[PDB]
Write a protein that binds this ligand. Structure first.
Ligand SMILES: CCCCCCCCCCOP(=O)([O-])OCC[N+](C)(C)C
Lengths: 54, 54
């Protein structure tokens, strides 16, 4: 968010990448994968970046 | 937060541990360190765990 720092967002993005590459996760619909990352507190941009990197 | 999976919260807690171990950070008042982590999106439960592991 607007008052946060990259240091604390970067591990969430990194985990999200590993999440999106995981064989269990990949069996769920794209929207469900995105909703899961949203419930993890990731911003729309962070989710989009995770998908790019995955 | 409570809805987060350990897969995502543990790496964040790990990041908070590194934060709390930092020499400059340790110079700041306790309340300031906790509040900094709160504005990063950690809950008191997660901050307590960070301190526990620090
Ligand atoms: C390496 C990444 C693989 C992650 C693959 C993870 C598979 C999802 C498991 C379902 O998660 P959850 O139960 O919503 O979260 C746990 C949070 N609590 C149980 C609500 C407290």
């Amino acid at each position: 968010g607007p008052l946060g720092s990259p240091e604390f967002r970067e591990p969430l993005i990194a985990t999200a990448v590993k999440f999106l590459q995981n064989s269990r996760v990949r069996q769920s619909p794209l929207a469900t994968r995105r909703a899961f990352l949203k419930k993890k507190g990731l911003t729309d941009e962070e989710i989009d970046l995770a998908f790019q990197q995955s």
